[model samples]
Structures are given as C-alpha cells and as structure tokens.
Target: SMSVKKPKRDDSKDLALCSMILTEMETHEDAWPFLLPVNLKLVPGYKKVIKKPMDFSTIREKLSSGQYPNLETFALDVRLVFDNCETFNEDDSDIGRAGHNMRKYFEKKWTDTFK
Candidate 1:
C-alpha cells in the first residue's frame, strides 16, 4: 500500500509534510477542525487514501479493533501532530496550539488508546 514514510526531522520538509497533511484534512474534513482536533486521516498509519467519508473516531475504532493494518504508525503520529501544529499557525492561541497540545497529551497516554 502507498504510505507516507517518515521524513527526517527538518524544518522545510516537516512543514511541507504538515502542509500536505493539512491539505488532506481540509479536503476530507474541515480545515483545522475545532478544539485541537486530532484528525486520524492526517496521522501516519491511518489510510491516506480513504474510500468512504468517515470521521477520525470511526477510523480510530476500526484500527483499534484490529480491523486495520499497520498499528505501528500510531506511535509516531503523536510526534507528527506535535510538530505539525506549527505548520497550522504560529500563534499562541488555542486554535493555533491545538494540535501541539493534543500531541503532548496523547504522546504518553495513547500507546494503547488504539489498542
């Protein structure tokens, strides 16, 4: 299956990846979907090419239940979302910092959230 391999931690490339993920979110869900939104589609290991219109929660459920492939991607997604927040915006406000905060919380807490 086609997938986004983890790119090296670099400024321009990371932002570019965040931009790509941003585009995916905007195209599938809403741009910056409210309150530090953690859109699963934007995360690694979740299907990048979704066939139907499903939200992040449903995807999370399916993946957690062992109905999906590549659960390993879940770990790094926390980090992805963490740094990707800056790509959304560099403001100190909630809207801008949402993704970052979401990542911070889930990074440690969600090793099994998807299990």
Candidate 2:
C-alpha cells in the first residue's frame, strides 16, 4: 500500500495577508466613512435600508477573532462596506466619493497581491 499526503492549508499566511490588507485600508485617506459602523441616531433610515452593515472596524474584529474562514469571505465583507456606502450615500456626495476611491484602492491592492 502507498500513502500520499495532501498539502495542508497555511492559515498563518492567510491571517498575515488579510491583516496587511486591512491595515492598508484602515490607513487609507478615503477610509474615513468606513472606519466604524454607521451612526443609527444620525441616519436612522440607514438601518431600514441596509440590513448588513459592514465597516473596517467590524472587519478587523472578525479578522482578529478568526471569523473569516478564508480571504474570499474577508474580501466580501470589505466589499460590503463599500456597497453599503453606495446604497446610503449619493454618488456625488463626499462619503460616496470616498467609498468609490476606497473600493478602487482595495481592488488594486487585491489584484496586485493575489492576481
């Protein structure tokens, strides 16, 4: 009988990569609006419109606590932050513009690193 071993997933490497990407996003100039959760008091309608609220802080917490199983899942949450921004803010609004810029930056970084 012959035994062959399959390669195991390198979780540490994934963690490090996710962390690095998140760090860059957090420090990005256009990341202001997505740094934390939306203020329900200030924008109560946001709750009614967007069901899943995602932000950089929330993503960081998920990353830190190992809530994300893989990079794809992590990336989805990051995207959700931008998607929610687009849903709540006007295209020409300051926050909306920031979301677009931040999304562009994230995609570029993702492509450069993974593609």
Candidate 3:
C-alpha cells in the first residue's frame, strides 16, 4: 500500500495553504465533497477521510453480532487534502501569515467551543 504524507502547516506556510483551500472552495465547490466551508481545510485529523473503512466480510460480521477487528482504526487523510490545496497555488500564497491566521482561528474556536 502507498501512503502520502502531507507537510505539517507551519508559520512559514499557512498563508499559501489557506489561500489555496479557499480558492478551491470558491471556484470548485466539489473539490472537498464534504462539510468544509468553502474556505478552510487546515484541520489535521478529522474531516473527509473514510474512517478505516471496512470490507464486506467485516460488515457482515458486525451485522451478525460478531466484532470485526478492523473497526477501530481510521485513515489520516489530512496530508492528501493539504497537498491538494497547496498544489492549487502558483505562487505558494499560503506561506506565512496564512498559518498564523489559521493558528488564531483555531485558538479562537477552541476557546469558544471547548468546555
């Protein structure tokens, strides 16, 4: 199997990343094909990826009162999306402050939502 690793967003690269993601949202709404707003795909662990999707036998076992051992894992698709977003920018616009903006947005959201 092949896995692609996405670069972690940093202070030096967030601007380009954020811009690219937003641009895609604005121009290609189908790009993410999920609940992401038309502007941000910066979260690292949660959206879009199938959570360790199971095969048919696994489904059948789970349905018949048996436990499918592969039911607890999930694929980390953060990098795939980030790479896709970055590739959209010709100038690498999400380079610095974009990350800072993301950091702030995250902080604010956590502050408001965390209990």
Candidate 4:
C-alpha cells in the first residue's frame, strides 16, 4: 500500500491557530477601536479614505464562516485594521495609540506562533 499524494499542510491546524490569535486580539485592552466597523455616519470621511475597511467583528464572522482560505488571508485583514487606524488617526490620539499597541501584540503572536 503506497499512496503518496497528500497536501503538505494541515488547514484545520492553521484555522485553529488563526482563531486563537483573533480571540486574544478581541480581549486585548487596546481592541476598542478595532472591535467593530467604523461608523460611516459619524466619520463619513472614513469611507472615502479607507476603501477596504476591516474590523474584529467582521474578521470573526469571516473566520467562523470559513471565508479566509488560509492564515495569510486572515492576517491581512487583521493588519488592515491597524493600517486604517494609522491613516485616519493621529499617532498620539487614543485610537491611534490603541491601534499601535494592538498591532504590536498581533505581530508578536503571529511571529511566535507561525514564523
């Protein structure tokens, strides 16, 4: 019995790892600004600036629904949350500071867990 046609990656393990990281980010102290989508009614300019907005709730939904085919895709959305923050908020401002902190935490976790 010799069958040598198998994918070399464990997708379930990848999904689990991604889910764990997202959970940590959600409970993080600096996750406030990233918990939900930006309110277009309040910050209408956000729509103009951030063409591809992302947030924890959306990411969580996508993850739960298996929308992200791989960990890299999931990571992209996570990073986008911070990128949008930097684009819209001053570095010294509350949301900006929180974005920085959250991004740092995520990067550390990603490197330790995946890289």
**Which numbered prediction scores highest in lDDT against the true structure?**
4
Order the candidate numbers by lDDT, best to worst: 4, 2, 1, 3
Using all chains and alpha carbons, the TM-scores for the candidates as numbered come to 0.36, 0.89, 0.22, 0.90
Task: Give candidate 3 regions above 4 Å deviation.
Answer: 1-94
* Candidate 2 lDDT, 1-98, residue by residue in tens: 25876776556677888899999999988888999998978887988999999999999999999799889999999999999999989999999999
Q: Which regions of candidate 1 fall more than 4 Å away from where they truly are?
A: 1-55, 58-70, 111-115
Q: What pairs collide in candidate 2?
A: none
Per-residue CA lDDT of model 4 for 16-109, tens digit only, reads 8898999999999889999998899898788888999999999999999989988999999999999999999999999889999999999999
Identify the candidate with maximal TM-score: 4
Off by over 4 Å in 4: 1-7
Clashing pairs in 1: none
Model 4 vs truth, CA RMSD: 3.4
Candidate 3: residue pairs that collide: 12-95, 13-95, 14-99, 15-94, 15-98, 15-99, 16-93, 16-94, 16-95, 17-94
Q: After best superposition, candidate 4 residue 106: deviation in angstroms?
A: 0.1
User: Candidate 3: what lDDT?
Assistant: 0.34
Give the Cα error of residue 28 in candidate 2, in Å: 1.0
True-structure lDDT of candidate 4: 0.92
